[PDB]
Amino acid sequence: NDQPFAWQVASLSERYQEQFDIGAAVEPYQLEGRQAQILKHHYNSLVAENAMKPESLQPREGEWNWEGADKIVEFARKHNMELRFHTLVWHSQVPEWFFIDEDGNRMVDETDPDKREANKQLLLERMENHIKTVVERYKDDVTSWDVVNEVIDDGGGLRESEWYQITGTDYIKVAFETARKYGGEEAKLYINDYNTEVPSKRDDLYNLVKDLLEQGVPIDGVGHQSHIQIGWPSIEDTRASFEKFTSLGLDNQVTELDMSLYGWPPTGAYTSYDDIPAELLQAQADRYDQLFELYEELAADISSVTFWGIADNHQWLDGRAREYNNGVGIDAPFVFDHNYRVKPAYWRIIDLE
Ligand SMILES: [Ca+2]
């Protein structure tokens, strides 16, 4: 017999009901058919893969695009699901209008110090109003806010995005302050990043959050994107990362979990699914077994575990595979395959501890 479909097997969220919520990143067109069936049965938390990015919501000043985001919000509400917000501030694909001064010129080019100070206040003003408008619309349904995303540099220190070039660290402080102001004391505010398991980047995130917390900035938790691989990162470095942020009184959430079949870069990717050798899917299952064993071990310190997709037929790792294999290649990062059939990894995370 073939592996059963995802809608034919025991629920993931139910299995982790006493541990932490189980979430999925979705697009609005996934809220129908088999994917909607899978979400209802297996997940109790949602995040928008793309519909609530800054570029999606306010592509130009005062021009709001709520409809895709509102769908996702309604779906969460009417199925009693938690809802993460991705994301309030992010260097990736930020609408260019944010960093254009009053005359139409680029703030990053400005050389006069007094004018650079004016541009900083203008940008912080635009950021505050973006946050205030979105938080005021969605605070009733959002249960975790990714306030800023990917502000640490892989090379060490802070990422020198336009946000940092123009405002220093002030965009981060003002972002959390504004989300707290309009979200209320009950809003849960997160800083999200990837490779939080790499000790040097972990330590830079820790020292940023520690300094900001000492200055009264309201940060409730750390989001660990957890874009991981079969062989990397180690269970030990993941454990050490969660422990370090818990020691500051912060919550931990796994926010964008997916496990590539390949290393970094994903060279040698398979071209079709049926070419993936069984041994490799089983290596993925063994890795997921260990990872979710660690999550349950640390469950008191993790509120939510979200996968960056539902099933292997829609995910961003395919594009990365093609990038490094001359425009051909697929990946298979989830516990439900491209046909929605359970994978070995599903069986290794549904079973009892
Ligand atoms: Ca297991």
Q: CA 340, CA 348: separation in Å to the nearest integer? A: 17
Residue-by-residue DSSP string for 117-152: HHHHHHHHHHHHHHHHHHHHHHTTT-SEEEEEE--B
Please answer whether residues 204 and 157 qualify as being in contact, where contact means their C-beta atoms are separated by less than 8 angstroms.
yes
Asked whether residue 27 is assigned to any structural domain, the reply reads: yes
Instruction: Out of 49, 82, 197, 256, pick the active-site residue.
Output: 256
Asked whether residue 316 is assigned to any structural domain, the reply reads: no
Helices (H), the chain: 12-15, 33-42, 54-57, 67-78, 113-138, 162-167, 170-183, 199-214, 235-246, 278-297, 317-323, 344-350
Asked whether residue 1 is assigned to any structural domain, the reply reads: no
Experimental technique for the deposited model = X-ray
Please answer whether residues 321 and 269 qualify as being in contact, where contact means their C-beta atoms are separated by less than 8 angstroms.
yes
Tokens standing for residue 336: 């439900």
Instruction: Out of 150, 186, 243, 297, pick the active-site residue.
Output: 150
Q: Which of 305, 253, 261 is nearest to 286 (CA)?
A: 261
Distances in Å between the Cα of 253 and the Cα atoms of 20, 129, 301, 319 are 9, 27, 9, 26
Please answer whether residues 110 and 72 qualify as being in contact, where contact means their C-beta atoms are separated by less than 8 angstroms.
no
Helix, strand, or coil (residue 67): helix
Please indicate whether residue 323 is annotated as part of the active site: no
Please report, to the nearest 10 degrees, the dihedral formed by the alpha carbons of residues 124, 252, 157, 173 taken in order.
20
Q: CA 45, CA 304: separation in Å to the nearest integer? A: 8
Alpha carbon of 102 to ligand 1 centroid (Å): 57
Give bridge partners of residue 5 from the DSSP assignment.
341
Please answer whether residues 336 and 343 qualify as being in contact, where contact means their C-beta atoms are separated by less than 8 angstroms.
yes
Residues with a beta carbon under 5 angstroms from ion ligand 1: 289, 348, 351
Alpha carbon of 345 to ligand 1 centroid (Å): 9
Asked whether residue 322 is assigned to any structural domain, the reply reads: no
Q: Which of 120, 99, 95, 195 is nearest to 153 (CA)?
A: 195
Helices (H), 52-104: 54-57, 67-78
* Gyration radius (Cα) of the chain, Å: 20
The backbone torsions φ and ψ at residue 319, rounded to the nearest 5 degrees and listed phi first, read -60, -40
Q: Which of 121, 117, 98, 99 is nearest to 108 (CA)?
A: 99
Q: CA 21, CA 14: separation in Å to the nearest integer? A: 9
Asked whether residue 274 is assigned to any structural domain, the reply reads: no
Domains contained in the chain, number? 1
Distances in Å between the Cα of 267 and the Cα atoms of 84, 89, 321, 326 are 32, 32, 7, 10
Q: Is 278 exposed, middle or buried (0-12, 13-18, 19+ CB in 10 A)?
A: exposed
Q: CA 333, CA 167: separation in Å to the nearest integer? A: 37
Alpha carbon of 40 to ligand 1 centroid (Å): 22
Instruction: Say which CATH number the domain at 307 has.
Output: 3.20.20.80
Q: Which of 147, 149, 151 is nearest to 135 (CA)?
A: 147
Q: Which of 155, 238, 144 is nearest to 192 (CA)?
A: 144
Alpha carbon of 344 to ligand 1 centroid (Å): 11
Asked whether residue 178 is assigned to any structural domain, the reply reads: yes
Final resolution, Å: 1.9
Tokens standing for residue 184: 């209320």
Please answer whether residues 342 and 312 qualify as being in contact, where contact means their C-beta atoms are separated by less than 8 angstroms.
no
Length of the chain: 353
Helix, strand, or coil (residue 234): coil
Alpha carbon of 233 to ligand 1 centroid (Å): 18
Asked whether residue 191 is assigned to any structural domain, the reply reads: yes
Please indicate whether residue 102 is annotated as part of the active site: no
Q: Which domain holds residue 247?
A: 6-261+293-311
Asked whether residue 330 is assigned to any structural domain, the reply reads: no
Helix, strand, or coil (residue 273): helix
Q: Which of 191, 304, 195, 308 is nearest to 254 (CA)?
A: 304
CB proximity list for 279: less than 8 A, separation 6 or greater: none
Alpha carbon of 287 to ligand 1 centroid (Å): 10
Please answer whether residues 147 and 89 qualify as being in contact, where contact means their C-beta atoms are separated by less than 8 angstroms.
yes
